[PDB]
From a paper:
The HIV-1 envelope glycoprotein (Env) is the sole target for neutralizing antibody (NAb) responses.
Half of the rh2011 KC mAbs belonged to the RM20E clonal family, isolated from the week 53 sample. RM20E1 binds to an epitope composed of one gp120 and two gp41 protomers with 1178 Å2 of BSA. Despite recognition of the conserved FP, RM20E1 did not neutralize the autologous BG505.T332N pseudovirus. The antibody did however potently neutralize the N611A glycan KO BG505 pseudovirus suggesting the epitope is shielded by the N611 glycan. The RM20E1-bound FP conformation is similar to the FP conformation when bound by the bNAb VRC34; however, the inability of RM20E1 to accommodate the N611 glycan likely results in the lack of neutralization of the wild-type virus.
Residue numbers in the entry:
A (entry chain A): 1 to 52, 52A, 53 to 82, 82A, 82B, 82C, 83 to 98, 100A, ...
B (entry chain B): 1 to 27, 27A, 27B, 27C, 27D, 27E, 28 to 213
């Protein structure tokens, strides 16, 4: 089966350059094009441009021309998208898409896995974990995972054993340029005296593991 | 040159029922040879897009018969015959006839279920976070449907603006509900100069808005 391999997630600073890559795997012939598509979080798909690897002919969207360059290396079945000068607005997911054609308009359409590009002035920081303590049926408790960079953070409860009724919200970007999320769990109120609940927070870019026990306090 | 308009933006479907997604172009998509080359994509949550339909109605390999593409000229439709749990996600029409290429804005298909009111909980800031100099107060809205909701913050019976941030989970696989967090961020100083902290929640499944509150220090 044909498939595209994309380079790994990038964290960059405003003004730096960046080249991301896309490699065809398991397709022989040269009857294909490679196009790059941007998707902001929560937003739709945007065509950025298309390259014919055979002659390196390119077509650019008018909205991205002069911000990016598309290139191809047939010798290794790889295509590239590069910026000279990144901006925070370039924080998005970028897909390369292979269009295998028959001047014809009919092809087959293989998408890559996407790569997340984070452009920000923040530096790596591990989270502070705070308890969202249950109070005075069904009770709610949780952990606030505050002030970390970059994404992602993984959260589990009781080392993966507590799974149902768990809601880990997607993180939001604070004005500090740090991320913040919470994870909550609804539990039977009787269980709050008999049981123990610990959130396990993993932020691997800073090698931070935190286990915080959320207890009702008074 | 060509502008694609897609409707509706969101589409609640009862499982087993059909979904119809529309896509209109600002000029006829019929190429100079007499053929039309509109495509449709599906993006499952967290997944790359995959092409379903090309050339208006032809289906790509492996895509089931219940995806039916139709249309002519400027008016095109994707019909999903019997929407099931695996079809939740965003659908995009794709125009590659005329340069510049573009995608519709996307139609989010979710699962219709009976209205469920949010269960609301409020969390005061931990004393650990207060020693850090910042107070986060969290309002949790748990397991509601539909997605529309509004939360509003009041401090010492004074409405707040511009100091809160929201986050929403995607549709839960089991119960088809959403949950929402809103976080109110104050300085420690500001937090201690006030007494009662409350969040008000408005949702189709509530007859009147609900308020959860606490008194700092109680």
């Amino acid at each position: 089966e044909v498939q595209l391999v994309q380079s790994e997630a990038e964290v960059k600073r405003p003004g730096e350059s960046l080249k991301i890559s896309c490699q065809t795997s398991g397709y022989n012939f040269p009857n294909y094009w490679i196009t790059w598509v941007r998707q902001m979080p929560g937003k739709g798909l945007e065509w950025m441009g298309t390259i014919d690897p055979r002659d390196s002919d390119t077509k650019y969207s008018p909205s991205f021309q002069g911000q990016v360059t598309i290139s191809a290396d047939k010798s290794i079945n790889t295509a590239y998208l590069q910026w000279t000068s990144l901006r925070a607005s370039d924080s998005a997911t970028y897909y390369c898409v292979m269009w295998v054609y028959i001047t014809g308009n009919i092809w087959v359409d293989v998408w890559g896995p996407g790569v997340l590009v984070t452009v920000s002035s923040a530096s790596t920081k591990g989270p502070s974990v705070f308890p969202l303590a249950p109070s005075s049926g069904t009770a709610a408790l949780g952990c606030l995972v505050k002030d970390y960079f970059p994404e992602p953070v993984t959260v589990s409860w009781n080392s993966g054993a507590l799974t149902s009724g768990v809601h880990t919200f997607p993180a939001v970007l604070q004005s500090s340029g740090l991320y913040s999320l919470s994870s909550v769990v609804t539990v039977p109120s009787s269980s709050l005296g008999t049981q123990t609940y610990i959130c396990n927070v993993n932020h691997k870019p800073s090698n931070t593991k935190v286990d915080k026990r959320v207890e009702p306090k008074s | 040159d060509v502008v694609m308009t897609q409707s509706p933006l969101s589409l609640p479907i009862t499982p087993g029922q059909p979904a119809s997604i529309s896509c209109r172009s600002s000029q006829s998509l019929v190429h100079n040879n007499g053929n039309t080359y509109l495509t449709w994509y599906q993006q499952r949550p967290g997944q790359p897009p995959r092409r379903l339909i090309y050339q208006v109605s032809n289906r790509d390999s492996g895509v089931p018969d219940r995806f039916i593409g139709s249309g002519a000229g400027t008016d095109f439709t994707l019909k999903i015959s019997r929407v099931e749990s695996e079809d939740v996600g965003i659908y995009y029409c794709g125009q590659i006839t005329d340069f510049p290429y573009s995608f519709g804005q996307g139609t989010k298909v979710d699962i219709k279920r009976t209205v469920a009111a949010p269960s609301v909980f409020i969390f005061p800031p931990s004393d650990e976070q207060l020693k850090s100099g910042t107070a986060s107060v969290v309002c949790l809205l748990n397991n509601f449907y539909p997605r529309e909701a509004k939360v509003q913050w009041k401090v010492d019976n004074a409405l707040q603006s511009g100091n809160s941030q929201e986050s929403v989970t995607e549709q839960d696989s089991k119960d088809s509900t959403y949950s929402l967090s809103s976080t109110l961020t104050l300085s420690k100083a500001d937090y201690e100069k006030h007494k009662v902290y409350a969040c008000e929640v408005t949702h189709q499944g509530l007859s009147s808005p609900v308020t959860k509150s606490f008194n700092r220090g109680e």
